[PDB]
Design a protein around this ligand. Structure first.
Ligand SMILES: CCCCCCCCCCCCCCCC(=O)SCCNC(=O)CCNC(=O)[C@@H](O)C(C)(C)COP(=O)(O)OP(=O)(O)OC[C@H]1O[C@@H](n2cnc3c(N)ncnc32)[C@H](O)[C@@H]1OP(=O)(O)O
Length: 86
């Protein structure tokens, strides 16, 4: 009964396959909000698309609380569970 979400955040890494950057997109935003909180980082370095995708997706959430973030984060790591099959 902790950040089981943070446990999902492990699963999504174990998926037999680096999910599609677009599903990663969502996962990041909720993940990052839940673990970090209201984005204190900058827009893209070495991986533009990616860099913002994560930044941008999260940045979208800034203001939302860690747990709400979890609720959907988790449910979305859940999607990988199926998409890829962990
Ligand atoms: C469209 C671009 C991504 C959308 C925004 C970020 C997505 C984050 C949510 C999903 C987490 C990644 C899911 C698995 C993806 C892969 O597997 S791709 C890497 C090759 N690895 C594998 O196949 C095995 C598992 N992978 C890994 O352990 C890492 O390489 C990992 C995927 C976690 C990170 O690699 P990658 O996505 O290629 O680039 P990063 O910039 O290093 O990470 C993406 C962003 O997500 C944050 N992050 C790191 N680890 C996680 C986990 N476990 N869950 C969720 N989010 C994670 C990073 O902080 C990074 O964003 P930023 O902070 O902006 O750089």
């Amino acid at each position: 009964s902790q950040a089981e979400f943070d446990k999902a955040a492990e699963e999504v890494k174990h998926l037999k396959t680096k999910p599609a950057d677009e599903e990663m997109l969502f996962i990041y935003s909720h993940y990052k909000q839940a673990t970090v909180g209201d984005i204190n980082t900058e827009r893209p370095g070495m991986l533009d698309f990616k860099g913002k995708a994560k930044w941008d997706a999260w940045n979208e959430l800034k203001g939302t609380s860690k747990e709400d973030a979890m609720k959907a984060y988790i449910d979305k790591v859940e999607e990988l569970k199926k998409k890829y099959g962990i």
